[PDB]
């Protein structure tokens, strides 16, 4: 039948109750909104005056001001910007969701040195969050003054003004509520301005007695081309931004172009702050500025957890914002920011590497973050390993790299050897490396608890696999003569192996002969599938580990024998003389226990070993 | 001069662009918005049909429907609600910020128990997130069937429709986009409904053929004194998809300015993902008017109570415009306190079932021991919830409040020994004297017990005193103290002699009062790290390497003044000041006692070499 056609309308009585009650949750960004509007006005007048320099005839110093007057209980914001006429008053302040900034920016030449904040059109009505009836004064260059008095009560009364001349520019006058009087102080206003709008391009002056005590004395240098800034101005900017009393260690300046564009600065601090791995509620390191206005700082998506030490600033031009201008829409975007920040931090480390004078300063403070990223980050595990420095046998006191070990490696070795312990003196003197160091092959010391987690996820390097020296098969590049020597020793030492096995039941899986000892007697090793000897000491002290899996993947101990020690050479003869001798059944157990103490294992009820030692002390004392 | 008075306005195109673009971040909540509207209409008609039951003559079943149609892209949503006349269409669907739901709910008679899920006035226009041309067929009981159509372009047509009858009830017919066809699969719509809009009181039926999506009626809205445990189990199994019945349950409500209902379930078996994911704390959910709002945002539940599962419902909270998060973040500081205070009582009434408490404490002990460390306010309530093994208990764990009742008349502290297993600490050299006098020792074997004891320091007025720390004070007789005094008066030469021998590894050599059979032990100082705390703080892999040198144990050797070996050693020490055997035996004894005390021996190759050297003398090599 017939079709009636209508037009959409808006309930202008609830549409403002929404904007005031619901959209805005923080009753502090009213000052940010007003400052941003003043900045729009100043940018407008500055861009317009680029053609006819006589526009500044009514006023020359572009600026912003704040004049809290507690006697009147009003927070005046004097200004010297473009202003706006009567028709502009009625068509910009009285129309919800209408903004002259966007219409002005859409009508300027293609490409200009201007970028304005604000496109939605509801920012000004946030000033009734913390204020009574508002009063706006204005003076354009093509009109006279016009007082504007509204109270968000369905009315706004433009009228003629007869007060003092302003020359050129707005003068907002709020009226703070009785309980919100706490924004007329020095401390609160300073904190809000510094937090939100510190990087505004025009001077801000707080007239409170009169002392023009400027609040914006730092300037954003990430906009300037990097080639223009000296390596010392970065230091001043770092000191001002972070309050640190020492200059930065390294600095990175890069930009990205495409459908997502932003600029970024990355400073590596000199000395790592204490309590670095504790604060889980606030990390706020990589701030996010959109058109030089604070947006957010706390979002793990910005940078992985293991890059917590990097402190910098990231600025973007046209990201999409929530209606409150505090949260980032399309939270899937951050997967590009993270991917672009990480691969640049790694290039920063790579370029810091070729200066081996302060790499010690960097490493001594930030080694743990690298060794944790190797465990967690599964994509950069290749480029994150070449930045590791490890103490080796053929070095002494100076740390060396894995790429130096590979460069010094023997022509016959087919793997990289390493040993895990508690300190360096304990590791160097250990029994396992006695044959590796005797042949001449280098060894890698790993004296850090995080090294076990680092080497679980590392399996090779430059095509060469990391094989330990406390596991089952340590295939030395052995000469063929020692093959037949091993055959003779094996065929000459069976009975002792079975006799030791039958006394060491349910403790050791199988007693074998050794190929990694030169002077020390029997040593205890573990099996391939399962935690190593040292890792048990860690995993049994984590204090947040389930108790069900301890007995499932523990270990498989394997005793060994050095076929040259007199202690075992005579023991074999004593065993062959009488395989059930009591002294043998005590000596083998004592030797097993004192070899177990050599490795990084621990016993159960060591009192049974203390008593064994005390009894044979009493034997020597004649008691 | 003159004061010109005007009135505010609103630009329609900009407002529409705002609402479409920059309000909602998830394009998948149009379905919950339309389902909320459907349930609003159903509640309207269900309330209307009370006073005048003739309203249900045009149809008597209350339901919701959904009919995806892939051949021509639509997504129907059939209802049986109050419907809308022409005036309602014109003055509700054409005004941005006007809501008839609020006006209807402002005219309730006195207190009618009906709750609607719309206040804002915007949210119908969230359909244009995924829809090209919405069509709303409608039929009230007063005015005939009208067809409504708009492309959200500042225009909408209210036709007069002669098509098929509906009887009574609206029928939204979306026209989905070209790349938004993904919302017609059974699985996708089923999952979206299950996640967002599951707990609504009216059946939802997806014609693919009547698989009602919501079979589980809510039970937190019923008086808890009317629910049997079988219903609680059957609701737990549906809520958490668990094949195992629950273990405990709490049902409390809070009245006042901030009101809410809550259920709390304690699972039977601890999941293997605790302390692991540390990304999403989705255990506790937040419902407002039986609609999903947000999962647990961190401060809802403290970390040490991560195992609690439950649901929280409320009738009035300050929701954001997107209805996806609360506005004021001060609510989640009172809700946390209320939930914690309720859980710490649920545990208390769980305690009195001794046969049932073991099944809980066997799997959820680490959480309590961490809460003692972190919850600085609830230590006096997490202290009586601990059970520990003792020397006079065998295989039956006992609580500290049971220990205090068995205390001797002369006891002035609580003794405790810490190690790495029960077998070691049962036979260690430290308890050899305390056990002798019939005193009750408390065992502590888990690593988290080191953090637990470090922050307790008290119980019922008693102070926790370790047995590996210097200064242990046992009730002694007058004869005993003078015997110890004369023993100290006859062992100064040997004490200073062996002190001269070492002079670096230990700082004193005293006379013992806690050893009976072991000749010598080692105890640390009172201001430092315990013997086992040091061994624990060298396996964190993320720590400050510097601070170990400043807060470190300060060893203090000890000697049993009656064991034969040291008694004979005193003879050789006084006879000759620098006999080789003496200066070897003291080092050997020190290292042997250093191994037995749980200390990480330094450079064990030397201690091994000593044994390998002195076995040869036994064999005469």
């Amino acid at each position: 039948e017939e079709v009636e056609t209508f037009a959409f309308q808006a309930e202008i009585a609830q549409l403002m109750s929404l904007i005031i009650n619901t959209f805005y949750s923080n009753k502090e960004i009213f000052l940010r909104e007003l400052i941003s509007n003043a900045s729009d006005a100043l940018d407008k007048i500055r861009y317009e005056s680029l053609t006819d320099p006589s526009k500044l005839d009514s006023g020359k110093e572009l600026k912003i001001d704040i004049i809290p007057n507690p006697q009147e209980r009003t927070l005046t914001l004097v200004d010297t910007g473009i202003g706006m006429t009567k028709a502009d008053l009625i068509n910009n302040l009285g129309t919800i969701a209408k903004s002259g900034t966007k219409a002005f920016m859409e009508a300027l030449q293609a490409g200009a040195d201007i970028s304005m904040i604000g496109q939605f059109g509801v920012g000004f009505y946030s000033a009734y969050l913390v204020a009574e009836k508002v009063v706006v004064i204005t003076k354009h260059n093509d009109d006279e003054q016009y007082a504007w008095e509204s109270s968000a009560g369905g009315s706004f009364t433009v009228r003629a003004d007869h007060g003092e001349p302003i020359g050129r520019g707005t003068k907002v006058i709020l009226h703070l509520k009785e309980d919100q009087t706490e924004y007329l102080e020095e401390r609160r206003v300073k904190e809000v301005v510094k937090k939100h709008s510190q990087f505004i391009g025009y001077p801000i002056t707080l007239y409170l007695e009169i002392d023009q005590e400027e609040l914006n004395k730092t300037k954003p240098i990430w906009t300037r081309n990097p080639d223009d800034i000296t390596q010392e101005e970065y230091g001043e900017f770092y000191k001002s931004l972070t309050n640190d009393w020492e200059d930065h260690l390294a600095v990175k300046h890069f930009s990205v172009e495409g459908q997502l564009e932003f600029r970024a600065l990355l400073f590596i601090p000199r000395r790592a702050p204490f309590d670095l791995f504790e604060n889980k509620k606030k990390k706020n390191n990589i701030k996010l500025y959109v058109r030089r206005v604070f947006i957010m700082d706390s979002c793990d998506e910005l940078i992985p957890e293991y890059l917590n030490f990097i402190r910098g600033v990231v600025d973007s031009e046209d990201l999409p914002l929530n209606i409150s201008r505090e949260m980032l829409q399309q939270s899937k975007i951050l997967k590009v920011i993270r991917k672009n920040i990480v691969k640049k931090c790694l290039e920063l480390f790579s370029e810091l590497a070729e200066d081996k004078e302060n790499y010690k300063k960097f490493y001594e403070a930030f080694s743990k973050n690298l060794k944790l990223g190797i465990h967690e980050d599964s994509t950069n595990r290749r480029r994150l390993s070449e930045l590791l420095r490890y103490h080796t046998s053929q070095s002494g006191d100076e740390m060396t790299s894995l790429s130096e070990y590979v460069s010094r490696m023997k022509e016959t070795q087919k793997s990289i050897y390493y040993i895990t312990g508690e300190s360096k003196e304990q590791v160097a003197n250990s029994a396992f490396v006695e044959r590796v160091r005797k042949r001449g092959f280098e060894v890698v010391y790993m004296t850090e608890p995080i090294d076990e987690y680092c080497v679980q996820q590392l399996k090779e390097f430059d095509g060469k696999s990391l094989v330990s020296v406390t596991k089952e098969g340590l295939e030395l590049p052995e000469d063929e003569e020692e093959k037949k020597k091993m055959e003779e020793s094996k065929a000459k030492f069976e009975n002792l192996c079975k006799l030791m096995k039958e006394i060491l039941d349910k403790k050791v899986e199988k007693v074998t002969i050794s190929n990694r000892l030169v002077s020390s007697p029997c040593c205890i090793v573990t099996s391939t599938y399962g935690w190593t000897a040292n890792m048990e000491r860690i995993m049994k002290a984590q204090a947040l580990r389930d108790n069900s899996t301890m007995g499932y993947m523990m270990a498989k101990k394997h005793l060994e024998i050095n076929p040259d020690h007199p202690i075992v050479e005579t023991l074999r003869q004593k065993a062959e003389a009488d395989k059930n001798d009591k002294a043998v059944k005590d000596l083998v157990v004592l030797l097993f226990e004192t070899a177990l103490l050599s490795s990084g294992f621990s016993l159960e009820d060591p009192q049974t070993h203390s008593n064994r030692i005390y009894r044979m002390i009493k034997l020597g004392l004649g008691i | 001069e003159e004061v010109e008075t005007f009135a505010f306005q609103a630009e329609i195109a900009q407002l529409m662009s705002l609402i479409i673009n920059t309000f909602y971040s998830n394009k998948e909540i149009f379905l919950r918005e339309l389902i909320s509207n459907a349930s609003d209409a159903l509640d309207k008609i269900r309330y209307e049909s009370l006073t005048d039951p003739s309203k249900l003559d045009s149809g008597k079943e209350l339901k919701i429907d959904i009919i995806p149609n892939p051949q021509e892209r639509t997504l129907t949503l059939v209802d049986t609600g109050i419907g809308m006349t022409k005036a309602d269409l014109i003055n509700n669907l054409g005004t941005i910020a006007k809501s008839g739901t609020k006006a209807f709910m402002e005219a309730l008679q006195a207190g009618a128990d009906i709750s609607m899920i719309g206040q804002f006035g915007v949210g119908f226009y969230s359909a244009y997130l995924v829809a090209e041309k919405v069509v709303v067929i409608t039929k009230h009981n007063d005015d005939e069937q009208y067809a409504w159509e708009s492309s959200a372009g500042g225009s909408f047509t209210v036709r007069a429709d002669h098509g098929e009858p509906i009887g009574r009830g609206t029928k939204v017919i979306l026209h989905l986009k070209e790349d938004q066809t993904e919302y017609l699969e059974e699985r996708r719509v089923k999952e979206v409904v299950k996640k967002h809009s599951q707990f609504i009181g009216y059946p939802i039926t997806l014609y693919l053929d009547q698989e009602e999506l919501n079979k589980t009626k809510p039970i937190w809205t019923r008086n808890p004194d009317d629910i049997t445990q079988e219903e609680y189990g059957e609701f737990y199994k549906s809520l958490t998809n668990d094949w195992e019945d629950h273990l405990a349950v709490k049902h409390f409500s809070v009245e006042g300015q901030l009101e809410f209902r809550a259920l709390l379930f304690i699972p039977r078996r601890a999941p293997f993902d605790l302390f692991e994911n540390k990304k999403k704390k989705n255990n506790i959910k937040l419902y407002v008017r039986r609609v999903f709002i947000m999962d647990s945002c961190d401060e809802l539940i403290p970390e040490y109570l991560n195992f609690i599962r439950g649901v929280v419902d409320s009738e009035d909270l300050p929701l954001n415009i997107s209805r996806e998060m609360l506005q004021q973040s001060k609510i989640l500081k009172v809700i946390r306190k209320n939930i914690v205070k309720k859980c710490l009582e649920l545990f208390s009434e769980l305690a009195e079932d001794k046969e049932n408490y073991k099944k809980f404490y066997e799997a959820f002990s680490k959480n309590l021991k961490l809460g003692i460390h972190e919850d600085s306010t609830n230590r006096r309530r997490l202290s009586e919830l601990l059970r520990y093994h003792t020397s006079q208990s065998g295989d039956e764990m006992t609580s500290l409040s049971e220990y205090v009742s068995r205390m001797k008349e002369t006891q002035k502290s609580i003794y405790y020994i810490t190690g790495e297993s029960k077998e070691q600490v049962a036979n260690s050299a430290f308890v050899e004297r305390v056990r002798k006098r019939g005193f009750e020792v408390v065992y502590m074997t888990e690593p988290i017990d080191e953090y637990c004891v470090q922050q307790l320091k008290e119980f019922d007025g008693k102070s926790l005193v370790s047995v590996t720390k210097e200064g242990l004070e046992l009730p002694e007789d007058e004869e005993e103290k003078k015997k110890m005094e004369e023993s100290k008066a006859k062992f100064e030469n040997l004490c200073k002699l062996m002190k001269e021998i070492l002079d670096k590894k230990v700082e004193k050599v005293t006379i013992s009062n806690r050893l009976v059979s072991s000749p010598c032990c080692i105890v640390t100082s009172t201001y430092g790290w315990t013997a086992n705390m040091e061994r624990i703080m060298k396996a964190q892999a993320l720590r400050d390497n510097s601070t170990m040198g400043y807060m470190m144990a300060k060893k203090h050797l000890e000697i049993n003044p009656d064991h034969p070996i040291v008694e004979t050693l005193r003879q050789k020490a006084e006879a000759d000041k620098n006999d080789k055997a003496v200066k070897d035996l003291v080092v050997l004894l020190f290292e042997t006692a250093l191994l037995s005390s749980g200390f990480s021996l330094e450079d064990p190759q030397t201690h091994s070499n000593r044994i390998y050297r002195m076995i040869k003398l036994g064999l005469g090599i």
């Binding site: 791995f277 504790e278 947040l544 | 302390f275 692991e276 540390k278 961490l370 964190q540 892999a541 993320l542």
Partner: peptide, 9 residues
Amino acid sequence: PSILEIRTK
């Protein structure tokens, strides 16, 4: 597989 250091002292 997770490093579970717990802030101590």
